[PDB]
C-alpha cells in the first residue's frame, strides 16, 4: 500500500550530537588506558560552554578539558563568527572518580533494568532501512565537502530528512528531501542551494527514486549563518532515533554515548543489532525486530521477542529458540561475543550507531550457522 | 502467539525526570505570566547541583532558583541523607532572555523539522498498552505510600519494569515485575519486601494476571539507601520512552519537557496521541499507530502514514481521508485543536504524558464524528 515514512538525521556539530562526540570521545580516552573502566559521562553544551560531568570508576588519568577541546576543533567550531570557538570556549567537569578496590564472570548480572530493540531489513545494502541510511548519507556527505575544501562556505550544523514511499515493503522512491546547512556570510541562497543540490544530494539520492515530483527543501528559511551551541543546546543521548533506526523500528529508554559496555542499554542494543542482521543475511525472514530485556542482578534476559512481520522462513518458535542459542545474551557474554573492551566508541558517535559494517555489532559471522540449524536451505 | 513484551517506569526523583518535571516547572510559571511565550530549558542535576540552561523569549520574569527549589521540595528530597537537599543544593542558570520585537496565523510553518508518532490500542480502559500503564501505575503508588505517611521509610527514586505474555494480542498475564525503591536505613529488606508486595504489588496488578510462576524482583540487589542525584545524573528528555508508550509503539528523536507548545517535538505527539485515540474510540480499528512528520517553514505536515495492524473497520485509504479532515495538524492548527497555550505541563512530567484522561490530548470528543463520516455502523 502506499505509505510515506520519514526519519531525520544531523551532522558532527548539531549541539545535541557535539555532546555525545564528547562523552565518547571521553569514553575512549579512558578505555584506551583502563579497557574495564566502568564510565557514565554526561555531556552539557550551551553557547560559552561545555560542562561534561560523569560517574567514572577506573584507574586511568586523562584531560577532560583537551579532550573536549580537540573534539571541538575536528567538529570545526573554531571562531567566535561560527558560533563557538573550541580554543576559547569555557570547559567545567564534574567528573566523581572511583578507582576500583559470580564463580563464572559470564554469569555476572545485569547492573540496571531495561528493555532494547534491535532491527534489520533486507532493504538496503547495509540491511538498515532505506530512510535513516540516506538520511545519514546526506548529512555525511556535507560533512565531507565541507571537510574537504570542495564546498567550504558550509559551517558545521546541519539536519537533514527524507521522506520515502513504499507500496508494500518496495520503497517506489523518495517523495521529499529537506537540507539545512549553517554557511558562511559570504555565500547567498540561491548560490548555496545550486551546491547542495549538485555536489550534496545528487550524488547521494538514487537517481531513480528522484521525481519530477520531489519537493526538495533546501534551507527553507534558511540563511543559517551563526549555528551549533549559539542559542540551541546539546545533551547527550538526546539524537537518540537517529543513532538507532530512524524510527523505523522502536526503542527503550536509552542512551548509548559516555556508556561503558557493561551499561545494557548500549551493549544490549548493539547485540540485538547483531542477533537481527545475522538473521536477515541468513535469509530467516526479511525484516526482523528483537526485544531483549535485563532486570538488576539477573543474568539471564527476562524476556526476548522476535517480530519478523509475515516475513519468516522458519516459524518464529524455531527463530526464539536459534537466537537464545547463537547469542550470549548475558551482560558479560554479549561484552565477549562482541568484544567490546577497546576505544572503538567516538567513530559511532555521529553517522549512525548502526549500518556502518566495520563495527563489531555490524558482522554477519553468523549467517551460515543460523541458516543450518534453522533447517539448512 | 505467546510472546513476552517488557516496558520500564521510574518515579518523580529519578533523576532524569527530576530534570523533566524542573523545566516543565519554568515553562508552567512562564507560561502562566505570558502563554505565547517561546521557551527550550534544557535541565541537568548532578550530587550538588541543578544547572537550568534555555532559551527563553518572553515578557514574563521568574524566579529560577525558587522554582526549582520548590520543585526539588515536593518530589522530597529535603535532607543530605537522602543523597540531596532541596533547601541547601546549588541552582545555576544560563538562559538567555530574549523580549519580543503569514495572513493567517493557522498557517504558520513549522519551528524545525522532525517525526511525531501517536498509538492508541483497544487494550486498556484508557486506550494505552497494558505494560507501560502497569509499569507506571506501580511507581506513582509507590509515590503515594511514600507521599501518604503508609510506608514512609521510603524514599523518592524507584524504577519499575513489567513483563507481559501475550497469546496474540490477548494480555494473557504478567510473566515478570521487577521493583526497585530507595529507602531509609530504619527498614531492612526483608521487611521491605512485605510491604512493597501488599501494599505497593498486590494492589496494582490484576490478580488474575498474577500467577504462581510470575517471578517478582523487589530490590534484587537492593538496599538502595541514598539515591536520587547523588552518584546517577539527570538530563531533560532521557525518559523519553517511559514519556510515550514503553516502547510500544515508535518514536521521533524528541523530547517534550522545557518544550512550549511551539514545538512540534511536543504538540504534534500530543495531537497524534488525540488522532489515533480518536481512531480507536471510534472503532474504525483496534490498534492504531500514526507518523506525521513537518519541514521547517512549511505548514502542512510533509507526511502521515497510519498503520492499523490488520485491526481496521474501513480501508486505511478512507481512514487517512478522515484523519486530514477532522485534525488541523499545521503546527498552530494543533496548538488550537487542543487548547494549549496554558500551564498544564508540570503535571505530564513524571508518571507519562499519555494515558491520563484529563490531558486535552486524552479527550474523544471526536469519536462520533469519525465513526459516522466512516460509514456510519
Ligand atoms: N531563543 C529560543 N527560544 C526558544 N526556543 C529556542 C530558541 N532558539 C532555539 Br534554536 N529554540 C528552539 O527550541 C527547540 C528545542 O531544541 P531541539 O533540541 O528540539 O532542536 P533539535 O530537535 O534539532 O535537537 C529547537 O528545535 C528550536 O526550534
Ligand atoms: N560511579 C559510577 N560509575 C559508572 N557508572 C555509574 C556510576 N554510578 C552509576 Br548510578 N552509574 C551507572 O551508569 C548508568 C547510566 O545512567 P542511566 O541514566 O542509564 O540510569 P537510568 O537508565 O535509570 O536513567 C546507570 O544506569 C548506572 O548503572
Ligand atoms: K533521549
Ligand atoms: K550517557
Ligand atoms: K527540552
Ligand atoms: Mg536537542
Ligand atoms: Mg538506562
Ligand atoms: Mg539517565
Ligand atoms: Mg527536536
Same mark, same amino acid.
Given at each position: 500500500?502506499? =505509505?510515506?515514512?520519514?526519519?531525520?538525521?544531523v551532522?558532527?556539530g !548539531?549541539?545535541?550530537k557535539?555532546?555525545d562526540?564528547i562523552?565518547d570521545?571521553?569514553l575512549?580516552?579512558?578505555?584506551?588506558?583502563?579497557?574495564?573502566?566502568?564510565?557514565?559521562?554526561?555531556?552539557?553544551?550551551?553557547? /560559552? +560552554?561545555?560542562?561534561?560531568?560523569?560517574?567514572?570508576?577506573?584507574?586511568?588519568?586523562?584531560?577532560?578539558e583537551?579532550?573536549?577541546?580537540?573534539?571541538?576543533?575536528?567538529?570545526?567550531?573554531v =571562531?567566535?563568527?561560527?558560533? *563557538?570557538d573550541?580554543?576559547?570556549?569555557?570547559?567545567? %567537569?564534574?567528573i566523581?572518580?572511583? %578507582?576500583?578496590?559470580?564463580?563464572?564472570?559470564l554469569?555476572?548480572?545485569?547492573?540496571?533494568?531495561?528493555?532494547?530493540?534491535?532491527?534489520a531489513?533486507?532493504?538496503t545494502?547495509?540491511?538498515?532501512?532505506?530512510?535513516?541510511?540516506?538520511? !545519514?548519507?546526506?548529512?555525511?556527505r556535507?560533512?565531507?565537502?565541507?571537510?574537504?575544501g570542495?564546498?567550504?562556505?558550509?559551517?558545521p550544523?546541519?539536519? %537533514?530528512?527524507?521522506? *520515502?514511499?513504499?507500496?508494500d515493503?518496495?520503497?517506489?522512491?523518495i517523495?521529499?528531501?529537506?537540507?539545512?546547512?549553517? !554557511?558562511?556570510?559570504?555565500?547567498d541562497?540561491?548560490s548555496?542551494?545550486?551546491?547542495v543540490?549538485?555536489?550534496?544530494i545528487?550524488?547521494?539520492?538514487?537517481?531513480?527514486?528522484? @521525481?519530477?515530483?520531489?519537493? *526538495?527543501?533546501?534551507?527553507?528559511?534558511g540563511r *543559517?549563518?551563526?549555528?551549533?551551541?549559539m542559542?540551541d543546546?546539546?545533551?547527550?543521548?538526546?539524537?537518540?532515533?537517529?543513532?538507532t533506526?530512524? $524510527? +523505523?523500528?522502536? =526503542?527503550?529508554?536509552?542512551?548509548?554515548? /559516555?556508556?561503558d559496555?557493561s551499561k545494557?542499554?548500549?551493549?544490549?542494543?548493539?547485540?540485538?543489532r547483531?542477533?537481527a542482521?545475522?538473521?536477515?543475511?541468513?535469509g530467516?525472514?526479511?525484516?526482523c525486530?528483537?526485544?531483549?530485556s535485563?532486570?538488576? $542482578?539477573?543474568?539471564?534476559?527476562?524476556?526476548?521477542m522476535?517480530?519478523?512481520f509475515?516475513?519468516?522462513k522458519v516459524?518464529?518458535?524455531?527463530l @526464539?529458540?536459534?537466537?537464545?542459542?547463537?547469542?550470549?545474551?548475558?551482560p558479560?557474554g554479549?561484552?565477549?561475543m562482541?568484544?567490546?573492551?577497546?576505544?572503538i566508541?567516538?567513530?559511532?558517535?555521529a553517522?549512525?550507531?548502526?549500518?556502518?559494517?566495520?563495527f563489531?555489532?555490524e558482522?554477519?559471522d553468523?549467517?551460515?550457522l543460523?541458516?543450518?540449524?534453522?533447517?539448512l536451505?
Amino acid at each position: 500500500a502506499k =505509505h510515506l515514512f520519514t526519519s531525520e538525521s544531523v551532522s558532527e556539530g !548539531h549541539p545535541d550530537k557535539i555532546a555525545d562526540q564528547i562523552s565518547d570521545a571521553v569514553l575512549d580516552a579512558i578505555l584506551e588506558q583502563d579497557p574495564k573502566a566502568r564510565v557514565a559521562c554526561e555531556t552539557y553544551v550551551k553557547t /560559552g +560552554m561545555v560542562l561534561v560531568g560523569g560517574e567514572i570508576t577506573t584507574s586511568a588519568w586523562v584531560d577532560i578539558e583537551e579532550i573536549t577541546r580537540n573534539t571541538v576543533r575536528e567538529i570545526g567550531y573554531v =571562531h567566535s563568527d561560527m558560533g *563557538f570557538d573550541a580554543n576559547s570556549c569555557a570547559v567545567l %567537569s564534574a567528573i566523581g572518580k572511583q %578507582s576500583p578496590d559470580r564463580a563464572d564472570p559470564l554469569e555476572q548480572g545485569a547492573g540496571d533494568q531495561g528493555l532494547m530493540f534491535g532491527y534489520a531489513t533486507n532493504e538496503t545494502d547495509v540491511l538498515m532501512p532505506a530512510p535513516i541510511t540516506y538520511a !545519514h548519507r546526506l548529512v555525511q556527505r556535507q560533512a565531507e565537502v565541507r571537510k574537504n575544501g570542495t564546498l567550504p562556505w558550509l559551517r558545521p550544523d546541519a539536519k %537533514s530528512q527524507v521522506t *520515502f514511499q513504499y507500496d508494500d515493503g518496495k520503497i517506489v522512491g523518495i517523495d521529499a528531501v529537506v537540507l539545512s546547512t549553517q !554557511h558562511s556570510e559570504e555565500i547567498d541562497q540561491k548560490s548555496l542551494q545550486e551546491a547542495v543540490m549538485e555536489e550534496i544530494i545528487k550524488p547521494i539520492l538514487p537517481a531513480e527514486w528522484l @521525481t519530477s515530483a520531489t519537493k *526538495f527543501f533546501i534551507n527553507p528559511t534558511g540563511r *543559517f549563518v551563526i549555528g551549533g551551541p549559539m542559542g540551541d543546546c546539546g545533551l547527550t543521548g538526546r539524537k537518540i532515533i537517529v543513532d538507532t533506526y530512524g $524510527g +523505523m523500528a522502536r =526503542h527503550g529508554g536509552g542512551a548509548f554515548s /559516555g556508556k561503558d559496555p557493561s551499561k545494557v542499554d548500549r551493549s544490549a542494543a548493539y547485540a540485538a543489532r547483531y542477533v537481527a542482521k545475522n538473521i536477515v543475511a541468513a535469509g530467516l525472514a526479511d525484516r526482523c525486530e528483537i526485544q531483549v530485556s535485563y532486570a538488576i $542482578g539477573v543474568a539471564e534476559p527476562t524476556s526476548i521477542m522476535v517480530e519478523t512481520f509475515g516475513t519468516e522462513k522458519v516459524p518464529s518458535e524455531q527463530l @526464539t529458540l536459534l537466537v537464545r542459542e547463537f547469542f550470549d545474551l548475558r551482560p558479560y557474554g554479549l561484552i565477549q561475543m562482541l568484544d567490546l573492551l577497546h576505544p572503538i566508541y567516538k567513530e559511532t558517535a555521529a553517522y549512525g550507531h548502526f549500518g556502518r559494517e566495520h563495527f563489531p555489532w555490524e558482522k554477519t559471522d553468523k549467517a551460515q550457522l543460523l541458516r543450518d540449524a534453522a533447517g539448512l536451505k
